[PDB]
Design a protein around this ligand. Structure first.
Ligand SMILES: CCCCCc1ccc(-c2ccc(S(=O)(=O)CCO)cc2)cc1/C=C\c1ccccn1
Length: 229
């Protein structure tokens, strides 16, 4: 029980309600890039001339569990092993053993000014409602206000609502028989102004690169370890 428990519950529930839905049949999502099981979609949205384009991706990763994927996504201690777009990050506050508030700066993308972010990051297990449903592991990263926020005059403050939502299929269980189904959503307000073409090019390049890189990292770090369901 920290002061964000209720907000966390709301953000997680919204993602469970809305973000998990399959968008194969939904023409409102534009499928931008497909590489195998990796499917990356966006909606073209601008507010006050700033690109907000919602990002939604699915993926199916052999050999790892949702629990493992989420631990690796969440655990700050391995962040620098997979992240390629971060210049700096600091843990601002520990709320609980499954929740922290993080400040980070993104590498500058010329010619836009650098962005920073301040967000609560929480990892949660959502039990299968019925014996028919999969359990879900989720990480949610969403912007919050904080006082120990750094002054950084080089940066415009972006605001994010990201979730990595994982269900695991199992087919001695070996990694050969496990598949992790990922839905990843990112809604990013870059703040300020940045050229629309730049924001779209960054999204189109960096999201598939992240998903490929990050998932491969989890496969590589877990191979030959006992499975953490
Ligand atoms: C001019 C450039 C503006 C950059 C806008 C931007 C700010 C923040 C973020 C962001 C993206 C993912 C997360 S997370 O998944 O929670 C993991 C922790 O880092 C947190 C923040 C994205 C983006 C915009 C594009 C973009 C896309 C994939 C990689 C990098 N940048």
């Amino acid at each position: 029980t920290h002061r964000f428990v209720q907000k966390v519950e709301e953000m997680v529930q919204n993602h469970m309600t809305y973000s998990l839905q399959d968008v194969g049949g939904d023409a409102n999502w534009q499928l931008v890039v497909e590489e195998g099981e990796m499917k990356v979609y966006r909606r073209e949205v601008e507010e006050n001339g700033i690109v907000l384009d919602p990002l939604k991706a699915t993926h199916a990763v052999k050999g790892v569990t949702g629990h493992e994927v989420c631990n690796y996504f969440w655990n700050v201690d391995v962040r620098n092993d997979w992240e390629t777009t971060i210049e700096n990050f600091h843990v601002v506050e520990t709320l609980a053993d499954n929740a922290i508030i993080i400040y980070q700066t993104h590498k500058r993308v010329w010619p836009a000014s650098q962005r920073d972010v301040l967000y609560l990051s929480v990892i949660r297990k959502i039990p299968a409602l019925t014996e028919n449903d999969p359990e879900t592991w989720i990480v949610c990263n969403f912007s919050v206000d904080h006082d120990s926020a750094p002054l950084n005059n080089r940066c415009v403050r972006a605001k994010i609502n990201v979730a990595m939502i994982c269900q695991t299929l199992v087919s001695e269980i070996s990694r050969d028989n496990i598949l992790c189904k990922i839905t990843y959503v990112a809604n990013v307000n870059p703040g300020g102004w940045a050229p629309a073409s730049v924001l779209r090019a960054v999204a189109k390049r960096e999201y598939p690169k992240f998903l490929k890189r990050f998932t491969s990292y989890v496969q590589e770090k877990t191979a030959g370890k006992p499975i953490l369901f």
